[PDB]
Design a protein around this ligand. Structure first.
Ligand code: DUN
Ligand code: DUN
Ligand code: MG
Ligand code: MG
Ligand code: MG
Ligand code: MG
Ligand code: MG
Ligand code: MG
Lengths: 226, 209
């Protein structure tokens, strides 16, 4: 698959998931149940989850190491919401055009190369990069291009590349569907499965498996034992 | 009590807590263990907790109602960090706070509006260039909308300040503290105690976690 094909595939997956979650024409700003959609708030709330994957608190668990497994999950959650904002921001949707525009972001090319492992000395800078995303998404707006650039730069610093993002995205997209199919809206969903959060179980599954439908089935099996 | 006394007391309690937690001269930006302090980050992270006290998500638990108990706790957590910024004597600081026009009103629904005020605080705490005075006004405007007044802030602040000391005395720093006590977050147990010396209750309660 070309870089643009990978991006088109994620956009198409995001569209389908949003359509199923929110109803058609969620792009107009509300779900079918009348709830306001704020993709920017979604993003800065995942940014808070991302920050909490690091030992940023000066008063709590100060010798603990970075949770890099969760870092990757939160980077992927952010991406779901950025894809959503791309689709919202814009009858006939041209996914290839959108993909082509994302592909032209200067740092995207760098994102497509092999990932580098981060280390403790990178955390200060990573936290400041996340803070910039929070700032951009909490104001008036807002520039979608600067957001993409800042996002890919952050994702590189966090040890992701397009490959890791894509494969993890697919898995989380499946879990997102699973959640909606199992009581996420009405509060009946159990997010902890025999002591592990669903994201952690998904990560275990992803160590082996990439196939969309196989992932769903495996989630189903594990959730029976939740 | 007068408003100035209430403010001075909070500022005094904050200094004590920060001294005990971080060591003397935390005002220079580092803890005794050499960790960099960012009060603004502390604030926007509590803002996230505050947002999460409302049914903001369009895709999850969409019929749930606001957790006003937790709203009060997060408004109080934000206040600890604002006091820390103010401090980063007490009479003069209290005098400035008391002069904030919205503060006077504070001494006396619309969830998406509340959320927008929280968002403004997040925005102000995450940019390059910061104004503490403007944050104060936004904060008290929000706290009114959340149903607090000075009395509620002050009484809840005292209680959480006690929990904060308790935490530090019981392994918060080294990861041995249990933050969930027999199925309830420590903040929820605190809230139950505050319906009703606080430190002794916490210590007794902590025994069965
Ligand atoms: O309209 C929506 C709403 C949610 N999500 C997904 C994206 C993200 O992957 C996830 C975040 O769900 P959450 O409820 O914040 N839980 P967690 O952050 O632990 O995944 O929800 C969408 O893709 N579209
Ligand atoms: O230097 C510090 C560090 C922390 N805190 C307090 C303020 C706040 O009340 C609490 C927040 O701690 P937390 O670990 O974020 N946990 P929670 O938000 O659940 O109370 O910590 C201070 O007062 N000073
Ligand atoms: Mg989330
Ligand atoms: Mg998370
Ligand atoms: Mg997340
Ligand atoms: Mg907190
Ligand atoms: Mg909280
Ligand atoms: Mg809090």
């Amino acid at each position: 698959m070309t870089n643009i094909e990978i991006l088109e595939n994620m956009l198409k997956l995001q569209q389908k998931l949003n359509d199923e979650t929110n109803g058609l024409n969620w792009e107009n700003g509300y779900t079918k149940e009348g709830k306001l959609i704020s993709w920017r708030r979604c993003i800065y709330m995942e940014c808070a989850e991302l920050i909490d994957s690091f030992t940023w608190k000066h008063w709590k668990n100060i010798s603990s190491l970075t949770n890099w497994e969760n870092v990757r999950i939160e980077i992927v959650d952010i991406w779901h919401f950025i894809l959503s904002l791309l689709l919202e921001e814009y009858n006939n949707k041209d996914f290839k055009a959108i993909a082509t525009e994302v592909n032209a972001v200067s740092v995207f090319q760098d994102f497509c190369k092999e990932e580098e492992y981060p280390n403790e000395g990178d955390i200060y800078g990573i936290l400041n990069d996340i803070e910039l995303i929070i700032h951009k998404c909490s104001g008036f707006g807002f520039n979608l291009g600067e957001l993409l650039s800042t996002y890919f730069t952050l994702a590189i610093k966090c040890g992701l590349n397009l490959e890791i993002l894509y494969k993890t995205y697919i898995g989380k997209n499946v879990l997102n569907i699973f959640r909606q199919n199992n009581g996420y809206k009405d509060g009946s969903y159990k997010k902890t499965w025999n002591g592990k959060e669903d994201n952690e179980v998904l990560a275990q599954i992803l160590e082996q498996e990439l196939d969309f439908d196989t992932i769903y089935k495996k989630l189903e099996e594990c959730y029976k034992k939740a």
